[PDB]
Amino acid sequence: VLYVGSKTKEGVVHGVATVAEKTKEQVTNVGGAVVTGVTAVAQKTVEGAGSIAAATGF
């Protein structure tokens, strides 16, 4: 609301360093969501919002 010289880092992912030799991601879905591999979602304010993998269904 009122900052007088601060330093903020609200809602941050910092450093996802990753090392791999092989990678075989094998997804076969039908009617839903799938998210694989590296993922670095970063939000500050989520006002009743969705997931990172949503499946509403019927």
Contact string (CB under 8 A) for its own copies, positions 14-43, x = contact: xxxxxxxxxxxxxxxxxxxxxxxxxxxxxx
Residue numbers belonging to the annotated binding site: 14
Closest approach, Cβ 9 to its own copies, in A, equals 5
Closest approach, Cβ 29 to its own copies, in A, equals 5
Residue numbers belonging to the annotated binding site for Cu cation: 14
Nearest of 14, 13, 11, 12 to residue 45 by alpha carbon: 11
SS3 state at 33: coil
Nearest of 21, 1, 19 to residue 10 by alpha carbon: 1
Contact residues for its own copies, defined by CB under 8 A? 1-58
